[PDB]
Motif scaffolding. Structure first.
Motif, mmCIF file in Angstrom:
data_model
loop_
_atom_site.group_PDB
_atom_site.id
_atom_site.type_symbol
_atom_site.label_atom_id
_atom_site.label_comp_id
_atom_site.label_asym_id
_atom_site.label_seq_id
_atom_site.Cartn_x
_atom_site.Cartn_y
_atom_site.Cartn_z
ATOM 1 N N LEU A 130 0.846 -1.186 0.000
ATOM 2 C CA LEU A 130 0.000 0.000 0.000
ATOM 3 C C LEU A 130 0.879 1.233 0.000
ATOM 4 C CD1 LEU A 130 -2.706 -1.033 2.651
ATOM 5 C CD2 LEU A 130 -2.611 -1.442 0.149
ATOM 6 N N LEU A 131 0.298 2.373 -0.345
ATOM 7 C CA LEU A 131 1.049 3.620 -0.375
ATOM 8 C C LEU A 131 0.377 4.665 0.503
ATOM 9 C CD1 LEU A 131 3.254 5.457 -1.412
ATOM 10 C CD2 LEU A 131 1.865 5.844 -3.486
ATOM 11 N N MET A 132 1.156 5.287 1.376
ATOM 12 C CA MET A 132 0.615 6.305 2.252
ATOM 13 C C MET A 132 1.488 7.538 2.181
ATOM 14 S SD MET A 132 0.164 6.231 6.476
ATOM 15 C CE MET A 132 1.834 5.913 6.693
ATOM 16 N N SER A 133 0.879 8.693 2.420
ATOM 17 C CA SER A 133 1.617 9.941 2.443
ATOM 18 C C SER A 133 1.015 10.804 3.546
ATOM 19 C CB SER A 133 1.576 10.644 1.075
ATOM 20 O OG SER A 133 0.255 10.974 0.704
ATOM 21 N N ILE A 134 1.603 11.969 3.764
ATOM 22 C CA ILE A 134 1.149 12.842 4.831
ATOM 23 C C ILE A 134 1.037 14.295 4.388
ATOM 24 C CG2 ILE A 134 1.575 13.512 7.236
ATOM 25 C CD1 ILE A 134 3.510 11.141 7.438
ATOM 26 N N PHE A 135 0.084 15.015 4.973
ATOM 27 C CA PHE A 135 -0.088 16.434 4.681
ATOM 28 C C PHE A 135 1.192 17.126 5.150
ATOM 29 C CE2 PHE A 135 -4.646 15.409 5.385
ATOM 30 C CZ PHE A 135 -5.156 15.922 4.197
ATOM 31 N N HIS A 322 11.932 7.336 0.115
ATOM 32 C CA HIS A 322 11.647 7.969 -1.165
ATOM 33 C C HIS A 322 11.462 6.843 -2.182
ATOM 34 C CE1 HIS A 322 15.587 7.046 -2.848
ATOM 35 N NE2 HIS A 322 16.187 7.623 -1.822
ATOM 36 N N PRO A 323 10.955 7.158 -3.384
ATOM 37 C CA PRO A 323 10.741 6.121 -4.398
ATOM 38 C C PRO A 323 11.872 5.111 -4.578
ATOM 39 C CG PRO A 323 9.797 8.144 -5.135
ATOM 40 C CD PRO A 323 10.639 8.489 -3.930
ATOM 41 N N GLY A 324 13.107 5.595 -4.515
ATOM 42 C CA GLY A 324 14.254 4.721 -4.699
ATOM 43 C C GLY A 324 14.377 3.588 -3.699
ATOM 44 N N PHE A 325 13.874 3.801 -2.487
ATOM 45 C CA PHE A 325 13.950 2.786 -1.440
ATOM 46 C C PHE A 325 12.892 1.698 -1.528
ATOM 47 C CE2 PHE A 325 16.717 5.686 1.073
ATOM 48 C CZ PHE A 325 17.673 4.753 1.455
ATOM 49 N N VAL A 326 11.912 1.868 -2.409
ATOM 50 C CA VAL A 326 10.851 0.877 -2.538
ATOM 51 C C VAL A 326 11.383 -0.548 -2.704
ATOM 52 C CG1 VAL A 326 8.873 0.113 -3.888
ATOM 53 C CG2 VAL A 326 9.193 2.538 -3.448
ATOM 54 N N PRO A 327 12.422 -0.737 -3.540
ATOM 55 C CA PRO A 327 12.950 -2.095 -3.710
ATOM 56 C C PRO A 327 13.428 -2.680 -2.385
ATOM 57 C CG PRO A 327 13.582 -0.766 -5.555
ATOM 58 C CD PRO A 327 13.057 0.188 -4.498
ATOM 59 N N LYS A 357 2.748 9.236 -8.156
ATOM 60 C CA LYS A 357 2.886 8.418 -9.354
ATOM 61 C C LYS A 357 4.265 7.766 -9.351
ATOM 62 C CE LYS A 357 -0.426 11.027 -12.105
ATOM 63 N NZ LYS A 357 -0.628 12.295 -12.865
ATOM 64 N N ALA A 358 5.269 8.507 -8.895
ATOM 65 C CA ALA A 358 6.621 7.969 -8.807
ATOM 66 C C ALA A 358 6.622 6.732 -7.897
ATOM 67 C CB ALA A 358 7.569 9.027 -8.263
ATOM 68 N N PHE A 359 5.976 6.839 -6.734
ATOM 69 C CA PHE A 359 5.906 5.717 -5.797
ATOM 70 C C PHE A 359 5.101 4.562 -6.366
ATOM 71 C CE2 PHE A 359 7.305 8.556 -2.344
ATOM 72 C CZ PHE A 359 8.163 7.677 -1.680
ATOM 73 N N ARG A 360 3.942 4.861 -6.941
ATOM 74 C CA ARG A 360 3.097 3.814 -7.503
ATOM 75 C C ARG A 360 3.810 3.068 -8.627
ATOM 76 N NH1 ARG A 360 -2.325 3.755 -6.980
ATOM 77 N NH2 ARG A 360 -2.056 1.759 -8.069
ATOM 78 N N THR A 361 4.488 3.812 -9.491
ATOM 79 C CA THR A 361 5.216 3.201 -10.598
ATOM 80 C C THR A 361 6.356 2.366 -10.023
ATOM 81 O OG1 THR A 361 4.762 5.164 -11.955
ATOM 82 C CG2 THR A 361 6.417 3.609 -12.774
ATOM 83 N N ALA A 362 7.067 2.935 -9.053
ATOM 84 C CA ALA A 362 8.176 2.238 -8.414
ATOM 85 C C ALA A 362 7.708 0.927 -7.798
ATOM 86 C CB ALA A 362 8.802 3.116 -7.346
ATOM 87 N N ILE A 363 6.550 0.953 -7.147
ATOM 88 C CA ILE A 363 6.033 -0.256 -6.524
ATOM 89 C C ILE A 363 5.792 -1.337 -7.570
ATOM 90 C CG2 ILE A 363 4.073 -1.292 -5.321
ATOM 91 C CD1 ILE A 363 3.756 1.341 -3.782
ATOM 92 N N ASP A 364 5.080 -0.996 -8.640
ATOM 93 C CA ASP A 364 4.794 -1.975 -9.686
ATOM 94 C C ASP A 364 6.050 -2.539 -10.350
ATOM 95 O OD1 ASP A 364 2.019 -1.917 -9.361
ATOM 96 O OD2 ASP A 364 1.812 -0.177 -10.690
ATOM 97 N N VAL A 375 13.178 2.242 -15.898
ATOM 98 C CA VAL A 375 11.756 2.524 -16.058
ATOM 99 C C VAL A 375 11.528 3.854 -16.760
ATOM 100 C CG1 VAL A 375 9.575 2.947 -14.883
ATOM 101 C CG2 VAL A 375 11.138 1.210 -14.009
ATOM 102 N N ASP A 376 10.760 3.821 -17.846
ATOM 103 C CA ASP A 376 10.462 5.033 -18.596
ATOM 104 C C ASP A 376 9.261 5.756 -17.995
ATOM 105 O OD1 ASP A 376 10.671 6.908 -20.841
ATOM 106 O OD2 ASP A 376 8.847 5.942 -21.601
ATOM 107 N N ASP A 377 9.547 6.708 -17.114
ATOM 108 C CA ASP A 377 8.519 7.497 -16.449
ATOM 109 C C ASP A 377 9.163 8.781 -15.942
ATOM 110 O OD1 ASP A 377 7.243 8.457 -13.806
ATOM 111 O OD2 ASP A 377 5.671 7.172 -14.642
ATOM 112 N N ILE A 378 8.723 9.913 -16.481
ATOM 113 C CA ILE A 378 9.268 11.208 -16.093
ATOM 114 C C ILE A 378 9.196 11.455 -14.586
ATOM 115 C CG2 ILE A 378 8.878 12.309 -18.316
ATOM 116 C CD1 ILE A 378 6.216 13.303 -17.345
ATOM 117 N N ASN A 379 8.085 11.058 -13.971
ATOM 118 C CA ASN A 379 7.905 11.242 -12.534
ATOM 119 C C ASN A 379 8.896 10.418 -11.722
ATOM 120 O OD1 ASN A 379 4.327 11.620 -12.909
ATOM 121 N ND2 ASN A 379 5.890 13.191 -12.558
#
Lengths: 388, 391
Positions: A130-135, A322-327, A357-364, A375-379
């Motif tokens: 799952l993905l969570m973020s904070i205000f 950050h997205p990079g740590f997802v792996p 989107k960066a996180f979601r793409t990274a997760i997939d 991965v080809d994704d500007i975000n």
């Protein structure tokens, strides 16, 4: 009954004797044997000269396991903590590392209402993490500011957005208003984007008003209740989790728990507090410092170890992510984990929408064992470029 | 609003930087009019003082750190006026930040208005007992486990006739319904009162799960409870506060420190004991605060917070505990003054002449100490056999 596992730095150098003194001192001091504490195990550990120096005394390290009869305490956490660590908490170099509840004792606790499966069904996200973020920067800002940030995070693909940790009842963004406004924002995003996001709202105030406020929150349409368990007490979390008139998940925040677990010589271990006890008490999610440490993996272990008495809780390693740590996160914690983007998601060049989107793409990508840089994704690309 | 004082072992050797960092990260984070109202929510560094370096610590932590005291002020507008929000605000994230310890909290006058302070306090306790001068004497039931009611009454009577002002339940209890110990205990104590004219109060342990405490406390009062003994830290300071704020619980509350050590045992982490057992307990409403006796500097610090003058709150009774016998009475009065409770623990039952004789020893010891006359030159057998067995 219950087995308490202690980590002791014995200055008398006699683990056996000390173990027996604790076993007696914390119980009876014929019909008395029925309440007598039993030394279950003693384990000698390696000596630490640095600690000897720090304590200006030679200490023998070891692990002691003592069994306290069920008849010696009421089956709740305040009584259990008092019996197993009330006196020892002030007796010196002794730390409570674990508590092993008998199957009979476990029957008195609720465990999570939803657990991993309940949360996944609620969100309808069945395999991926799952993905969570904070205000970010809610204090002093109005409801319109909150609504815009919430909308961007949801459009970004975040599954759960949580209130800022220090957001208390105030004139600009009071509880029911945050909930009502937030619910409408997320429903709108769902209606148009087809993605459902949940809002975990901070439940604060006086201990004795929590149930009333929790029910006002539910009535207003709250999705998840965010709770600073350790600012109130595990027994309080338990009562909330036990109420069927509070039919929503509870996300526990570790605030203040460090006061208990920071030391290696005293206190209560983080895995027991943020892992086992939170789970038994009813937390559907447990946020804890990330290893970005065996400490973190231990908490997670207790949150998810198989146990016929309790549903499993979602692990949420937090901070420095950050997205990079997802792996690393998925390898370390598995797929049943919550990726906590924190408030850093708003720092992405394309706002929260781009960060999500960066996180979601990274997760997939991760789930397909596909490298992130390929991965080809500007975000996702700009994310790896700015954060690493 | 509220000022927090921290003891930090900075591994970045830059107290001034870490401080400003903390004052910002824990508070705020645009058109002029908006910026102006937002500045009201920013944390402000009030004081930064460096301390002597500790090599043993450097070795222990396997890194070199700079010891210092930092003071950060947090605007009231940033939190609801309650302990949970206060602790979350001042030490929520920081508690997991590393080597940082909450040493003190200075509440503002307006903030203090949101807290009760003791219901009875020193003067209220003295009026209840009709003992307006000397320090009080307290003892604890001993060997109560596995015993009947008749046994309790007998030991209760002996402690009372011995001159004990307050008798409390011991820490480990497992047969004797509270309403029963209360009712029967009351009977015994009224008997002693109408026979010797001496007033003794029975402090009963208040238990149950958090959300049953108020109803349980009121039932205890209805049964005639004199004082409610409460393990504050097994439940939370905010719970103690709600009990103290409840007018339907018109009785004193005696705080026991059980579990608090989980917070204050470390010198590098947690919350300091004096802040916990002293200031917060008083603000939250504890009429008595039991804490380990120096028989050291923390014991006095605690006592100081409990008794220091404050127009917002009544003062609380200090109750140094452990390692106390008649011989120490002169010391206790010296270190804590007359408004202190002499905790005889369960040590009175060890007196060669039982509890009655042990109580008399303490009562004779305090009257003598207030007369400045040394205990050695006191012609009292009970007191003599005490000083002869305990030193």
């Amino acid at each position: 009954g219950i087995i308490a596992t202690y980590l002791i730095h014995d200055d008398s150098h006699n683990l056996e004797k000390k173990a027996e003194q604790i076993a007696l001192g914390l119980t009876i001091g014929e019909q008395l044997k029925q309440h007598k504490g039993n030394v279950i195990h003693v384990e000698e550990l390696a000596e630490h000269e640095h600690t000897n120096s720090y304590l200006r005394k030679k200490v023998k390290r070891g692990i002691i396991k003592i069994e306290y009869p069920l008849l010696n305490f009421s089956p709740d956490l305040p009584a259990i903590l008092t019996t197993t660590f009330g006196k020892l908490s002030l007796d010196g170099e002794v730390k409570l590392i674990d508590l092993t509840f008998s199957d009979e004792l476990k029957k008195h606790f609720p465990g999570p209402k939803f657990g991993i499966d309940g949360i996944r069904n609620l969100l309808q996200v069945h395999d991926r993490p799952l993905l969570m973020s904070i205000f970010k920067g809610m204090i002093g800002r109005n409801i319109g500011y909150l609504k815009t940030q919430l909308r961007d995070q949801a459009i970004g693909g975040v599954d759960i957005v949580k209130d800022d940790e220090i957001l208390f009842e105030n004139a600009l963004t009071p509880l029911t208003k945050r909930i009502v406004s937030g619910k409408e924002v997320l429903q709108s995003v769902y209606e148009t984007y087809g993605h459902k996001t949940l809002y975990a709202v901070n439940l604060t105030g006086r201990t004795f008003d929590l149930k009333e406020n929790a029910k006002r929150a539910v009535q207003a349409g709250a999705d998840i209740l965010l709770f600073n368990v350790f600012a109130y007490g595990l027994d309080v979390l338990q009562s909330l989790a036990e109420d069927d008139e509070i039919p929503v998940p509870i996300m526990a925040h570790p605030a203040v728990s460090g006061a208990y677990s920071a030391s290696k010589l005293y206190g209560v271990s983080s895995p027991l507090l943020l892992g086992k006890l939170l789970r038994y008490a009813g937390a559907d999610f447990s946020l804890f410092p990330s290893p970005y440490k065996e400490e973190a993996l231990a908490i997670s272990k207790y949150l998810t170890e198989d146990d016929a008495s309790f549903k499993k809780s979602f692990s949420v390693p937090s901070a420095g992510i950050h997205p990079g740590f997802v792996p690393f996160i998925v390898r370390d914690f598995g797929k049943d984990v919550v990726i906590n983007a924190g408030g850093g998601i708003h720092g992405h060049p394309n706002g929260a929408q781009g960060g999500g989107k960066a996180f979601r793409t990274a997760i997939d990508a991760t789930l397909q064992n596909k490298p992130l840089h390929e991965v080809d994704d500007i975000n996702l690309h700009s994310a790896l470029q700015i954060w690493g």
